[PDB]
Amino acid sequence: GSSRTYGKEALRANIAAVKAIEEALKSTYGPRGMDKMLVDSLGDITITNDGATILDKMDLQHPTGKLLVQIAKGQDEETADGTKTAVILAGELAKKAEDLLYKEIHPTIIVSGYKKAEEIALKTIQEIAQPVTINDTDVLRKVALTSLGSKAVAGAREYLADLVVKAVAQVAELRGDKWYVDLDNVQIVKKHGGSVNDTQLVYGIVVDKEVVHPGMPKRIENAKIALLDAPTQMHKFLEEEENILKEKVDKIAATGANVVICQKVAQHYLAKLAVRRSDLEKLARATGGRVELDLGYAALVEERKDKMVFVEGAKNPKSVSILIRGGLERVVDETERALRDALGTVADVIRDGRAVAGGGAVEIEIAKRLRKYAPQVGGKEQLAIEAYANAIEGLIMILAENAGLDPIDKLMQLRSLHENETNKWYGLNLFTGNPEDMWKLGVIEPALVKMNAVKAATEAVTLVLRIDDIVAA
Template sequence: MSQMQGQPILVLPEGAFRTQGRDAQRSNIMAAKAMATMIRTTLGPMGMDKMMVDDLGDIIITNDGATIVDEMDVEHPAAKMVVEVAKTQDDEVGDGTTTAVVLTGELLSKAEGLLDQGIHSTLIARGYRIAGQTAQKTLEEIGQPVTLKDKAILKKIGATSMTGKSAGESREYLADVAVSAVIQVAEEGEDGKISVDLDNIQLEKKQGASITDTQLIQGVVIDKEVVHSGMPKKVENAKIALIDGAFEVKKTETDAEIQITDPNQLQAFLDQEENQLKTLVDSVVETGANVLLCQKGIEDLPQHYLAKAGVLAVRRVKESDMKKLAKATGGRIVTNIKDLTKDDLGKAKLVDERKISGDEMIFISGCKNAKAVSMLVRGGTEHVVDEVERSLHDALGVVAAAVEMGKYVSGGGAVEIELAKRIRESADSVGGREQLAVNAFAEALEIIPRTLAESAGMDAIDTLVKL
C-alpha cells in the first residue's frame, strides 16, 4: 500500500489517451508534417487551389494558406499550433502563410531525423536558434532598400503575392490599386519611420462586373442609402456633419404621468416635440452642412426637415465607418448635435448614392489628403469576389510591410538558397552536436525552391543543383 502512495492516478475523459516521451514527439511532428504536406501543393505561381466544403455545404475555392488553415477543423494540439503560426503570419504581414506552414513542417521533419540519431531535443532547438540568428543577419545584409517613391518595385511586390491565385491574371491592375491605397494612408513619424495602418483601408465587395472594375475611392464607401426620398442623391462640394447622437426626442429617466383635460394641451405637447426636433435640424443646417452622416437613428420628422433643407442624410452608419470618415474628410465626430460648428465639418468633392449590383451605396469621394480610403472589389461570381478580396488583403499586407521595414528580398526561392548557403558556411564555427541541427535548418529551407520546382513540373533535384 505504501508503494502505491507515490504513484499518480490519472483520470481521463472517455475517448482520451495519454502519450509521453518519444511517442508524444513523433505524434506532434507527424501532425505538423501532415498540415505542411496538405498545404504545400498550393505554394507558388503554379500552385493548385483547394476546394473546401463546410457542414452547411458552402464552398470555398482558394490557395490562400491563411484561409485554408482557418477553415480546417483541427483537433490535434500540435496541428493547432501550426494553425496559430499561419494566423500570426497573416496578422503580422498579410501573406506568406503557406511558406510559414511548409517551413514549420520541414523543420520538424529534419528534427525528427536528428532525434532518431539520438540527438537531444534541447541541442536541436539550440542549433535552430543559432541558424535562425544567422538567417536574420543575412536577410538584413541582402535586403534591398525600398521607399514610398519606388512605386514600380512596390507594384512588383504586391503582384508577387497574388501570383498563382484566381485573381492572378489581373494582378498587375490590382497591385497598382493596392500600392496607391498604401501610399495614400501611409504616415511618416517624427523619427522618419513610415507606418501604415491597414484598418484605414476599407474593402467593400460587390458581386458583378469584371475584376478590373475594382476601384480605389479617395474616401469612404458606405453600404447604406439616403434615408428620405425627398433628399438629394448627389451633393457636390460636400460639407459633412458627422453625428454620434440620435435625431429623436430624449426620453426622461423617470416615469411620469400627465393628465390632459383639453385637446389643446395635447397639441401643445406635440408642437413642443416638433420644435425640439426642428431645433436639432436647425443646428445642423446653420453650420452650412449639406450632408449628414449619423451613427444612430433619424426619426421621420427630422427626415422631413432635412429633406426640406436640401441635406443628404444617412443613418445608422457603423462606428468603424464613422472613424474612417473622420480621417478621410477631416471632420470631427460630434456627440451633442447642438454643439456642432462649421469647424467640425468634413469636406469632400462629391457625396452621392449609386446603385451597385442592385444595392444602393453611398460614395464619399474626392477627399483632399484622405488618410482613409476604400476599395470597391468587383468580380463575376461570389467565389471570384471573395478570392479577389483575399488577394488584395495579401497585397496590401506585403506592400505595407515592405514600406514599414524599408527593405525587400527576391522571391522564387532565391533568398532561401542564399540563406541555406550562408548557414552552412557558418555551421563550421558551431561546435558539438548543434552543428548537425544548424545544417538541418539549412536543408529545411530548401523545401521552398524544391516545392516551387515540383509545382512547375520540373525535376526538384536537378533544379536545386543548378541553383
Template sequence: MAQLGGQPILILSEGSRRTVGRDAQRMNITAGRVVAEAVRTTLGPKGMDKMLVDNLGDVVITNDGATILGEMDIQHPAAKMLVEVSKAQEDEVGDGTTTAVVIAGELLKRAEDLLDQDIHPTVIVRGYKLGNEKAQEVLGKIGENISSEDRKSLENIAITAMTGKSAERASEPLAKLAVDAVLRVADKVDGKLKIDKDNVKVEKKQGGSIADSELILGVIIDKERVHSGMAEHVKNAKVALLDAAIEIKETETDAEIQITDPSKLKDFLDQEEKMLKDMVEKVKKSGANVLFCQKGIDDVAQHYLAKAGIFAVRRAKKSDMEKLARATGGRVVSSLEDLSEKDLGHAGNVEEKKIAGEKMVFVTDCKNPKAVSILIRGGTDHVVDEVNRALDDAIGGVTAALEVGKIVGGGGSVEMEVAKHVKDYAQQVGGREQLALNAFAEAIESIPRALAENAGLDPIDVLVNLRSVHEKSGNKWMGIDVFDGKTKNMFDLGVIEPLKIKTQAIKSASEAAEMILRIDDVISAKSGGGGGAPGGMPGGMPGGEEGGEYE
C-alpha cells in the same frame, strides 16, 4: 498511476490519458507535418487550390494559406500551433503564411530524422535557435533598399503576392490599386513611413469583372440615405460626423406621464416634435449638408433633415466613422451641442449609387484622404472573395516593404542564399549542433523544392542547379522560373518580395518547431465521450491513441 509499497496511487482522473517520451514527440511532429502538407501544394505561381466545405455546406475555394488553416476544423493541439504560426504571419505581414507553415513542417520533419539518430531534442532546439539567428543576420545584410518613389518595384511586389491566385489574370490593374491605396494612407513619422492597413477599406460586390474593381479616394459606406426625399447626390459636401442619436432620449429612471386631457396629448407630441426639430436645426446651423450618424435618427427627424436639404445616413459603423474622419478631415462629435463648422469634413461628392442591386453611399473627391476604399468586382461571390484575399496579400506586401524599406528576390532565391550561409556557419559550429544547423538549412530549402514540385519540375535537379549557381556565381538573386524551369535572376523578372515576409516566416516557424520539440509528455483530460489522448482526430488528423478529442 504510480505504485508505492504495493499500493497504487492515482494521480490523474479516471479517463485521462498520457503519452510520454518518444511517442509524444512523434505524435506532435506528425500532426504538425500533416498541417504543413495540407498547404504545401498551394505554394507558388503554379500552386493548386483547396475547396473547403463547412458543416453548413458553405464553400470556400482558395489557395491562401491563412484562409485554408482558418477554415479547417483542426483539433490536435500541436497542429493548432502551426495554425497560430499562419495567424501571426497574417497579422504581422499579411502575406507569406504558406511559406511560414511549410518551413515549420519541414523543420519538424528534419528534427524527426535527428531524433531517430538519438540526438537529444534540446540539442536540436539549440541548433535551430542558432540557425534562426544566423538566418535573420543574413537576411538583414542581403536585403535591397526600396522607397515610396520606386513605384515599379512596389507594383512588382503586389503582383508577386497575387501570382498563383485566381486574381492573377487582372494582377496588373489590381497591383496599381494596391500601391495607390497604400501610398495614399501612408503617414510619415520621424522620417519613417507608418501605414495602418485598416485605413484601406475593401468593399466586395458581385457583378462585372475583376478589371472593373476601382480605387475610391474616399470611403464607401454600405448604407443608404435615410429618406427618399433627400438628394441622391451632394456636391461640395460639408460632412458632419455624429456619435449621438437624433432621437428623444428615454429617461434613465422609471417615469410615468399621465395625460388626462386629449389636448395635452397633442401638446406633448408637439413638444417631442419641436425637440427633434431643434436637433436638426443644430445640424443645419453648423453648415453641414451631409450627416453621418453612428446611432439612430428618428423618423420625424428624417423628415426635417430632408426638408433642410441635408443628406443623412444612420447607424454607420464606428470603423467607418473613423475612416470618414481621416478621409474628409472632419471630427467625430459626441454631442449635438458641440457640433460646429470647424468639426465638419469636406468631400467633393457624396452620392448614393446602386451596385449589384444594393444601395451604397460613396464619399469621394476628398482633397488629401488618409483613408481610401477599394471596390472589388467579380463574376461570382467565390471570385470576389478570392480577389479580396489576393488584394489583402498585395496590400500587406507593399505595406511591409515600405515600413521596413527592404526587399529580397522571390522564386526561392533568398531561401537558397540563406541556406548556403547557414550551412557554412554549421561548419564553424561543429558538434551535434552542426547536424541541427544543416537540418535547419535543408528546411529553408523546402521552399524552392515545393515551388519546383508544384510546377511539375524535378525538385532534385532544380535544387542542384540553384546550389551550384549560388556557390559559383555569387549571384544571390538566382531563383527558379517555374514557367520554364530555368534558373534566372529574380530581380530581372520582377519577382520580388518584402524582407519582412521572410524574416517573420523563418522566425515564427523556428519558434513553433522549437516549442513542439521540447514537449515530451502529453496529458489529456477526460472529454465528453470518454478519455483519450489527442489522437483519433476528425478530418484525418494524425495522432497517437484512440478516443478523446481536443475541443
C-alpha cells in the same frame, strides 16, 4: 487509470504528429498548386488552397499537433503571410532531426544547434536584401501584382495594380524615421452591377447612396459637415413632434452646417443637404468632425449618377476610399479578399523598407552561409547546423516538385549557378521549367515575412523536441 509515456517512444510519437500535419499542407504550397476539399458535418462543400483556412476546418486528435497548429495560426495575425512556409519548414527540421537521433545524439545538442543557426540566418537576410521607397513605384507595382495574381481578377486588369499602389501611396504617415500605414485609413465600398475595370479610386470618401432628397442643393463647396447620432392633447403632441422636425433646422442655423448626416418629412424646409441614414466614425476621421452643437470640414460634396454621394477634399488628407462594382456577387466578394490582402502586403513593404526575391532565391544564399559557418562550430553541433541547411534547401524541392518538374536536377542547377559570383537572384520560374533571374521577372516579397517564417518554424520544432514525457490524469 491513466497513461504515462516517456523516452524515445514519446519523442517518436510527437514527430509522427508533426509529419502528419505537414503532410496535409505540403501539396498546396503555391502558386500553381493543388487545392483541398473540406466537408463539414452538415454536408457543405468547400474548395480552398488558403492555409489559414485549412487549419481551422481540419480537426486534430493529437495534442502536440494542436500546439504546432496554434503557433502557425498565431503566426498569421501578427504578419498575415507565411502560414504554410512556417509549417513546411517545421516539417523538414523535424524530419531531419530524426536522422540525427539514429546516430544517438542527445536532443539538447540538436536544439542547441538549431538555435545557433537561426541567429546567423537572420543576419544573412538583413545582409542580402535591397532597399525600396515609395518613389520606386515600379517595385511597389511588382509587389502588388505578385500578391494580387493567380485569380480571375489579376493583372490582366492591371488597373487593379495601380489602383492599390496609388491608394496606399496616398496614405503615408512618417514615424520612426520611416513611413507608416494602417488599413483603418483606407476604405472600400462594394456593390453589384458593374465591371472590374469600372472599379475606381477617388482620393475622396464615398457612399453608394441611391437617394438624397430632391429639393436640396446637390453641390456644396468649401463647406461645413455635421455627423449625428442625433384627442386635444394628442393633437398638441402630434404638432410638438412636427415642430421637432424644424428643430433640426433651428440647430443647424445655430452652427452654420451645410450637409448634415444622421444615423436613423421636413426636407423642403432644409432645402429652402440631408443624408437620411462605424461609418459616421469614418466620416469623422476624414472630415475632422465629431459624431449640443464639433463640425467637420470639406472642400466639396456632391451627389451624382446607379446613384451615389461623394465627399472630396475633407480636412484630413490622409484618408481614401475605393469602390468595387461588379456584375456578379461571386466576383466582388472574393475580389475584396484578394485586393485588401494585396494592399496589406504593400503595407508590409512600406512598414520596413527591405525587399527580397521570391522563387527560392533566398534559401540558396542561406544554405551557402551556413555551410561556410559550420566548420567554425566544430563539435557535435556541426552536424546539427549542416542538418539545418539541408532542411532549408529541402523547401524549394516542394516548390519544384509541385510545378511538374524533376526536383533533384532543378535543385543542382540552381546550386551550381550560385557557386558562380554575383547571380544572387537566380531562382525557379514556374511558368517555364528553367531557372531565370527573379528580380527582372519582378517576383518579390517583403523581408519581414521571411523572418517570421524562419523564427516561427524554429520556435515550433524546438518545442516538439525537448518534450520528454506525457502524463494525463
